[PDB]
C-alpha cells in the first residue's frame, strides 16, 4: 500500500537513493499502489554524478512492499521495506541498468520483462 507522501527506496542503479510518491496513477480517487503499479514520484535523495538529480519528477513501478503480495493459494510474501524502480516518464521504461534485491512475480508482464531479466532473484 503506497500512497502520496510515502517514502520508497530505489531498487535500481539509476542514482536515486529514495523517492517520494506524489500520485497513484491509473484511476480516480485511487489511493493504494501495490506491486506492479505505476506511481508518479519525485526524487528526494540522489547520489552525485548519477543519471537523475534531486527534484526530478518521474514515474516508477513498485517492486517491493511491506504489506506484501497475495498468492492464489493464500500465501503471502512480505519485504522489510518498500522499493520501486524508476521508469522513463514518456516511454515507461526502466532507467537503471541493474535491479537490486529480490523481485516479485506480479511483474511477469510484457512491459516489465526488462526488470525480471535483471532481477537477482525470481
Amino acid at each position: 500500500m503506497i500512497q502520496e507522501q510515502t517514502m520508497l527506496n530505489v531498487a535500481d542503479n539509476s542514482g536515486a537513493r529514495r523517492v517520494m510518491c506524489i500520485k497513484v496513477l491509473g484511476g480516480s480517487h485511487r489511493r493504494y499502489a501495490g506491486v506492479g503499479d505505476i506511481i508518479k514520484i519525485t526524487i528526494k535523495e540522489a547520489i552525485p554524478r548519477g543519471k537523475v538529480k534531486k527534484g526530478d519528477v518521474l514515474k516508477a513501478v513498485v517492486v517491493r512492499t511491506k504489506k506484501g503480495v497475495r498468492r492464489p493459494d493464500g500465501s503471502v510474501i512480505r519485504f522489510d521495506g518498500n522499493a520501486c524502480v524508476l521508469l522513463n516518464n514518456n516511454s515507461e521504461q526502466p532507467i537503471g541498468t541493474r535491479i537490486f534485491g529480490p523481485v516479485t512475480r506480479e511483474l511477469r508482464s510484457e512491459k516489465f520483462m526488462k526488470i525480471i531479466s535483471l532481477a537477482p532473484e525470481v
Binding site: 498468492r71 493459494d73 534485491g101 532473484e121 525470481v122
Partner: protein, 114 residues
Amino acid sequence: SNIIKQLEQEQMKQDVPSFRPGDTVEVKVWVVEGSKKRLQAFEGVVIAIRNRGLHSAFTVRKISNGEGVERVFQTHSPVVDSISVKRRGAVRKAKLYYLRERTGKAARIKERLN
C-alpha cells in the same frame, strides 16, 4: 461441525514433518513459468506457526540480496511440495517477531542440542 472436520480431513497432507519456531527450514514450492513447472527452494528461519488443521500455516524469514523477506506458507497447499528441517534452533517463544529488528550477529539462533 463434524461435517467441516471430515471435509478438511480428506485433503490434509500426511507427509508434513515436525518443526518448531527457530528452526531453519528449506521449503520446495512449485513455480510455473509458462507451460513448464519448476521447483525453487525458499530457505529461512521459522518465526511463526499457526496450527488450524487444514488452515495451518507458518512464516519463514530470510535475507536475500540484502533485503529481508517473509513468506507465509500454507502448509497443506499443493503449491508447497516438501518441507525439510536443515537446522534446529532453541528459542523460548512461540513467535520470533523480535528477529525483525535484528540482523547479523544479533540475529543468531542457538542450535537445539537435545
